[PDB]
Design a protein around this ligand. Structure first.
Ligand SMILES: [Mn+2]
Ligand SMILES: [Zn+2]
Ligand SMILES: [Zn+2]
Lengths: 49, 1415
């Protein structure tokens, strides 16, 4: 299925992750990357809410 | 017995060459042993064929060089006695001949290099007598000739061999040695083991073998090894938890790493600097940096200068200085007449002007010398002081026009406008007369390419100054142009060495002065746009960061400053700093690192510029790796990795080779003196004492007291333990692992003056004279040939000590005396594998190289192939097989994709710390279940143990000079003390045999096998002690270890036990000779292997690496080969990470470099309009086809339709491949219309058919000092580029009559036609459009032109064969068999000198259609 349980942006947070279209993000990275665009900068797909 | 004798006498009387000489040998033989004279007549036939083939006079009377020199009246002193086979005298030019025939390639190459040595000695000797000789070597590997038929000679040799079956010849004569060499000379061995040797091994072999067997068990059970491993691990963990063993692995803390990097160089760097102060200080740091950002505000003289430069190479007259003076007067008048009309002073600096040969001559000196010359000419006799100069100027211009007309320069092309010769020239020449930084330091923003453009202009000026011939104010100068101004770079020193340049202007005088090295500023010669664009790309990587947006501009300025700083100041210290930065950033994002990391990252920096670079790097990291970023670490890591790999922009060559050679010798010698085996003068004839020392050191090497001792393991100490070696051997045995005198007097007087030009004289005297008393032999004979010798040496030593039948006639014809006949425990009775040490350039640090003769080469090759066969039986290593390496890449991607732990290890001092004795020991204890072969490997490794290494002459000469200076006129190093102690007793180190030296390369596969088995055993021990599997991949220098899920969860839940296991791994590896280097890293995200980095299963681009590789690789070969090289490099780069824009810019930069060299760019060179599809699934031919389609957009469509129909009818239609091979050999221009009419497609009209391209290599290839398919299967970068620019201006192109001429002559003859238009598209593709009227009519220059449509069809068909038939759509092995079948003569000549399927078109479309190689 999906990959490991980590945030692919900061590489170190592993608690309280929300699922992307195919992987996980931490809340801090989510609220930090929501301000640039709605597309996942890694998946090239829109981020859910 | 006389039956065969009379038979061969009849044979020689019937079949023999009776030209004028061999009848004498026949009558001298028939009165006389059969085999000897048979070989003698054969070799004499070879010799007469050699002297008649090389046009040399046969030397039959055994006359040496002294006889030849006495018969001509040349009196020479006592020199070397050598007799040639042929000689040729032409004035001061002698041609010498030496011939020999050898069956074994080893003996052949040995005699080749021996003849080379004797001939270079003879040339050096006769040079001291001013006699120029040219050598010639006739080495014939076969016995064939042109006097006796082949089968007749074979029958003769077979009769000799059948008469060798008797015993009377063997017992009466033919002693063992000479008879053996005679039998091997007539044999056909051509040496896979060659075991037919005389084994007389002494007891020392058994001593060494028993040394590898005592104490070691190697026959344990698979259960006891596990118990011993468990107990050792328990004791180790206990002693670590107590504290007697120091920890070697520390947890990573980003804050602590950043603080330790910032505090680096705290004793010389003040503190953290702001970006503004950095930009302020950068723009005024160095003179070259001051020149940048300084806000600095036809051509009749240039035409005359270039014209006189063109006629200067031909040596029109033996009046060198007078020619210079006349050309100076002419350029003076030209500049006067050009400056009066409309132009200002362009080539002036103030009381001095740039004359021919791009040199600055002061106007006052010109006036003075011309005045003296004209008055001296006027003393002899009326002309009124001006008719003389006018007449001589007419003579010079007439001679120049004649010397340029016979080659066809067509002087009118230079736009000289030859009216400047005035009758009032003398008067016009005599009446002619013309914090410390002058400008404002710092005005230009760091966003425009003005700084890069000025840097490119300066670098081009430097590299053009590098090539000044400097024949005979004397300061030379180059000129470099700019916008509203143009400047002059002045310099006095010549050559390719580093010198002191001065940037000057006419309006302000001197502007800058700096000591620079010319050959290093290459990657910035024309890199105007590619550098800015790659910096823009690197910034766009981290542009979408959302946390550095308020500072990204500062980041960009910083990066550009770093780039300009490393390009304007290429220093090896900067390269080392950037590589250590790479190591740091690699170890930054990991989980554990080595305690000695910071001591390795820190590198000694001087000159105050490297400190600025370090401050820039520190600020850049503080900006990108600030505490509050926590977003897209991948992009930032890639950015920093590229900033570190930016080191490639600097040239990898060494500034001065003496210092790097001393450094290499230091790295070579330090561990040996640290260990205690430095035996000097190995004394090939083995003595007992060296053997005693050898066996004692071998015994000491095996102690390596483990952790069970009192003190404990001494890390970084060479030695292997007996217990662990026994464990390894036992685990491998069972199924567990795999499952002049005046000069000398002047030097002495200069030394005396210095005590109470001369310095160089004293240095040369000490380097060439003191070494004579320690002659220990290339450089020794070189110094002896430059000098009576005995008396001078004795006087110098006193003055320095005061202040303190196997004959000869058959040896050159039948057999050789160079082959080993016996062998003992030291070597094959001829040499104990003597090597020579050299250095190989690399990016960070130079590597070592052991070069040996052919016998050593084949011995090491035998051992290498044996161990490679052994390793191929396994499936763990990845060194030279692409399949296992690809499998390793796949496994690494799979493991990293699941966030597993990865241990990237490098091993410090892998070369000097390994040992052949270790390999011998680990070999003698294995079983190798299925004696011949094994004893051979054993004795070969024993030979490797007794190894000689020749100390280079440069380093020993430097140490001798330093010793002399210290004895006559301070923290001496280890090697310095060693050399001084050796000199204090009289002996000089020539070879140092030791135990602890594995050759860097000569033992590659065996080292790989040893590393493989050892790492497999270590991983097995770890798995049995913890409960987790470990995969390993090695490359004989550094390796990767991939852990399973158990170790990952263990690290996640227990750091202490994990670090305990890691330190136990370190301890077991150090018990072997596997010293783990501090660069090692244990990281769960990034993985390094063979300079390949993996972050999330993907691969990092490493953009700057490929960009610098493309900007660097420019050789001096033929231009099409250069285009091929650049295309391969850009293909690789686009394949890995590089986008299309940078690669297009690199291609355009290469084309511009080629334009500067004045070359007729042809469309078959490069395609710089890429839209990236032809790099993923396209070859070079498809790219050239796309370029041509872009050139002529109409005919390409018709030809593509024709070829599409033809390919469709070929692949699955009527068979036509049988007649096309001959159809493609007729007239091409007619054949196109013929085939278009045959297929039904409308042929191209006359307009779109006359297009042709200029092929200078139509008759012969360019003389870059028959098809190309039959030939392909057979210094520095700046020097190469300047040589390319120099040849492409000289007589490079050849004519049909085998005559040389200039390209400018070809353009001139083209300009003498009324048909062509010379139209190019956008960047100078320069394709012609000659009409077909003059097409090959009267053998004119149209012969060089070649039609474009035919070659377009060739290339399109080639691509259709190679990669599918979709290429024809609208743009929206057995080859040698076919070569021999179609071209028999071409298959005979220039093919194999030392060595149905639908492919006949692939070989037929290039042997006639001279476009590319196509294969
Ligand atoms: Mn490595
Ligand atoms: Zn995160
Ligand atoms: Zn995502």
């Amino acid at each position: 299925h999906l990959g490991p349980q980590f945030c692919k942006s900061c590489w170190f947070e592993n608690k309280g992750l929300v699922e992307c279209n195919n992987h996980y993000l931490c809340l801090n990275c989510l609220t930090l990357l929501l301000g640039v665009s709605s597309r996942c900068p890694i998946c090239k797909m829109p981020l859910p809410t | 017995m006389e039956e065969d004798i009379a038979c061969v006498k009849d044979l020689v009387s019937k079949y023999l060459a009776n030209n004028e000489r061999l009848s004498r040998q026949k009558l001298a033989f028939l009165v006389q042993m059969l085999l000897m004279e048979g070989l003698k007549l054969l070799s004499l036939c070879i010799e007469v064929d050699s002297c008649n083939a090389n046009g040399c006079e046969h030397n039959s009377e055994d006359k040496s060089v002294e006889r030849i020199l006495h018969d001509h009246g040349v009196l020479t002193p006592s020199l070397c006695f050598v007799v040639p086979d042929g000689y040729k005298l032409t004035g001061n030019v002698l041609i010498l001949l030496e011939c020999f025939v050898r069956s074994s390639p080893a003996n052949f190459e040995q005699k080749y290099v021996e003849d080379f040595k004797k001939l270079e000695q003879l040339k050096e000797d006769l040079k001291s007598v001013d006699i120029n000789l040219i050598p010639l070597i006739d080495g014939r590997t076969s016995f064939y000739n042109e006097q006796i038929p082949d089968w007749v000679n074979d029958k003769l040799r077979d009769t000799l061999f059948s008469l060798l079956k008797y015993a009377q010849e063997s017992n009466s004569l033919f002693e063992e040695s000479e008879y053996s060499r005679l039998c091997e000379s007539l044999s056909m061995t051509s040496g896979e083991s060659l075991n037919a040797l005389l084994d007389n091994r002494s007891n020392h072999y058994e001593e060494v073998i028993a040394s590898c067997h005592q104490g070691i068990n190697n026959k344990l059970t698979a259960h006891e090894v596990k118990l011993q491993i468990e107990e050792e691990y328990q004791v180790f963990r206990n002693r670590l938890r107590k504290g007697e063993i120091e920890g070697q692995f520390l947890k990573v803390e980003k804050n602590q790493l950043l603080n330790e990097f910032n505090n680096l160089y705290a004793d010389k760097v003040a503190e953290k600097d702001s970006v503004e102060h950095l930009t302020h200080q950068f723009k005024r740091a160095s003179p070259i940096l001051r020149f940048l950002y300084a806000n600095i505000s036809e051509c009749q003289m240039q035409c005359w200068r270039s014209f006189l430069n063109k006629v200067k190479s031909m040596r029109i007259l033996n009046t060198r200085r007078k020619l210079l003076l006349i050309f100076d007067a002419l350029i003076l008048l030209a500049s006067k007449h050009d400056q009066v009309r409309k132009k200002p002073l362009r080539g002036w600096l103030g009381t001095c002007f740039v004359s021919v040969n791009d040199r600055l001559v002061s106007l006052e000196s010109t006036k003075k010398d011309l005045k003296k010359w004209v008055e001296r000419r006027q003393q002899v006799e009326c002309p009124s002081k001006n008719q003389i100069l006018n007449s001589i100027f007419q003579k010079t211009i007439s001679k120049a026009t004649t010397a340029l007309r016979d080659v066809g320069i067509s002087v009118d092309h230079y736009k000289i406008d030859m009216e400047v010769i005035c009758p009032d020239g003398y008067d016009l020449i005599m009446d002619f007369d013309v914090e410390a930084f002058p400008y404002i330091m710092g005005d230009v923003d760091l966003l425009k390419t003005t700084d890069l453009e000025r840097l490119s202009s300066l670098s081009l000026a430097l590299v053009n100054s590098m090539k000044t011939s400097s024949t005979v104010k004397e300061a030379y100068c180059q000129e470099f142009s700019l916008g509203e101004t143009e400047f002059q770079l002045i310099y006095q020193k010549t050559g390719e060495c580093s010198k002191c340049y001065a940037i000057n202007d006419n309006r302000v005088g001197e502007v800058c002065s700096f000591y620079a090295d010319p050959k290093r500023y290459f990657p910035a010669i024309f890199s105007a746009e590619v550098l800015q664009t790659t910096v823009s790309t690197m910034i766009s990587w981290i542009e979408d960061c959302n946390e550095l947006e308020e500072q990204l501009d500062k980041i960009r300025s910083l990066t550009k400053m770093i780039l300009i700083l490393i390009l304007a100041h290429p220093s090896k210290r900067s390269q080392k700093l950037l590589q250590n930065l790479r190591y740091f950033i690699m170890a930054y994002v990991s989980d554990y690192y080595h305690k000695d990391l910071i001591d390795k990252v820190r590198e000694e920096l001087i000159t105050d510029v490297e400190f600025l670079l370090y401050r820039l790097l520190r600020t850049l990291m503080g900006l990108v790796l600030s505490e509050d970023v926590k977003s897209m670490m991948t992009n930032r890591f890639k950015f920093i990795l590229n900033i570190s790999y930016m080191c490639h922009f600097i040239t990898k060559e060494t500034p001065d080779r003496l210092t790097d050679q001393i450094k290499c010798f230091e790295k070579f010698l330090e561990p040996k003196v640290k260990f205690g085996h430095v035996s000097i003068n190995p004394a090939d004839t083995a003595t007992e004492e060296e053997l005693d020392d050898m066996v004692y050191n071998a015994k000491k090497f095996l102690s390596k007291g483990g952790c069970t001792s009192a003190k404990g393991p001494s890390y970084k100490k060479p030695g292997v333990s007996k217990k662990y070696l026994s464990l390894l051997t036992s685990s491998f045995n069972n199924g567990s692992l795999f499952k002049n005198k005046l000069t000398a007097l002047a030097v002495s007087q200069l030394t005396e003056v210095f005590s109470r030009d001369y310095e160089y004289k004293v240095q040369q005297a000490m380097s060439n004279l003191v070494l004579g008393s320690k002659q220990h032999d290339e450089i020794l004979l070189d110094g002896g040939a430059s000098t009576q010798l005995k008396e001078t040496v004795e006087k110098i030593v006193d003055q320095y000590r005061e202040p303190v039948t196997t004959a000869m006639l058959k040896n050159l014809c039948f057999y050789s005396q160079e082959s080993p006949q016996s062998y003992n425990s030291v070597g094959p009775d001829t040499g104990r594998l003597k090597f020579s040490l050299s250095y190989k350039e690399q990016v960070g640090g130079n590597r070592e190289l052991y070069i040996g003769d052919l016998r050593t080469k084949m011995f090491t090759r035998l051992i290498e192939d044996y161990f490679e066969a052994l390793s191929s039986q396994l499936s763990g290593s990845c060194l030279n097989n692409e399949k296992e390496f690809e499998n390793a890449i796949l496994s690494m991607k799979l493991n990293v994709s699941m966030a597993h732990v990865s241990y990237s290890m490098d091993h410090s001092k892998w070369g000097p710390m390994m040992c052949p004795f270790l390999f011998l020991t680990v070999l003698q204890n294995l079983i190798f279940l299925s004696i011949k072969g094994r004893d051979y490997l054993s004795t070969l490794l024993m030979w490797h143990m007794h190894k000689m290494v020749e100390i280079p002459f440069n380093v020993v000469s430097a140490m001798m000079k330093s010793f002399i200076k210290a004895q006559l006129g301070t923290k001496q190093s280890i090697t310095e003390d060693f050399f001084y102690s050796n000199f204090q007793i009289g002996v000089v180190p020539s070879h140092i045999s030791s135990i602890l030296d594995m050759g860097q390369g000569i033992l590659h596969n065996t080292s790989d096998f040893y590393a493989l088995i050892t790492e497999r055993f270590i991983n097995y021990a770890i798995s049995c002690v913890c409960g987790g599997t470990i995969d390993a991949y090695t490359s004989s220098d550094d390796q990767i270890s991939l852990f399973d899920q158990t170790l990952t969860e263990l690290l996640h839940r227990d750091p202490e036990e994990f670090r305990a296991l890691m330190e136990f791994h370190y301890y077991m590896s150090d018990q072997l000779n596997k010293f783990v280097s501090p660069k090692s890293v244990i990281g769960r995200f990034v993985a390094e292997f063979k300079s390949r980095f993996f972050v999330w299963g993907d691969e990092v681009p490493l953009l700057t690496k490929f960009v610098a590789a493309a900007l660097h690789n420019i050789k001096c070969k033929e231009p099409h080969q250069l285009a091929e090289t650049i295309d391969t490099i850009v293909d690789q780069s686009v394949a890995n990470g590089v986008p299309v824009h940078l690669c297009n810019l690199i291609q355009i930069r290469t084309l511009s470099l080629l334009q500067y060299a004045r070359y007729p760019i042809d469309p078959f060179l490069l395609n710089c309009e890429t839209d990236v599809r032809d790099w993923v699934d396209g070859n070079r031919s498809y790219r050239i086809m796309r370029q041509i389609e872009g050139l002529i957009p109409d005919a390409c469509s018709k030809i593509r339709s024709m070829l599409r129909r033809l390919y469709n009818r070929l692949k699955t239609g009527q068979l036509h491949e049988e007649f096309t091979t001959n159809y493609l050999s007729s007239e091409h221009l007619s054949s196109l219309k013929n085939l278009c009419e045959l297929l039904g497609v409308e042929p191209p009209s006359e307009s779109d058919l006359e297009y042709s391209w200029l092929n200078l290599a139509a008759h012969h290839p360019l003389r870059m000092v028959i098809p190309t398919i039959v030939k392909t299967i057979q210094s520095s970068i700046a020097s190469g580029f300047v040589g390319l620019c120099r040849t492409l201006g000289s007589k490079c192109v050849r004519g049909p009559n085998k005559e040389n001429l200039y390209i400018k002559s070809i353009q001139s003859l083209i300009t003498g036609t009324q048909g062509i238009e010379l139209l190019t598209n956008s960047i100078g593709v320069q394709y012609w459009r000659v009409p077909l009227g003059l097409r090959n009519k009267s053998e004119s220059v149209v012969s060089y032109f070649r039609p474009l449509l035919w070659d377009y069809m060739c290339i399109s068909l080639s691509t259709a064969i190679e990669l599918g038939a979709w290429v024809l759509g609208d743009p929206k092995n057995h080859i040698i068999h076919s070569l021999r079948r179609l071209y028999p003569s071409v298959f005979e000549k220039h093919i194999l000198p030392f060595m149905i399927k639908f492919l006949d078109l692939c070989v037929a479309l290039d042997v006639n259609c001279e476009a590319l190689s196509l294969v």
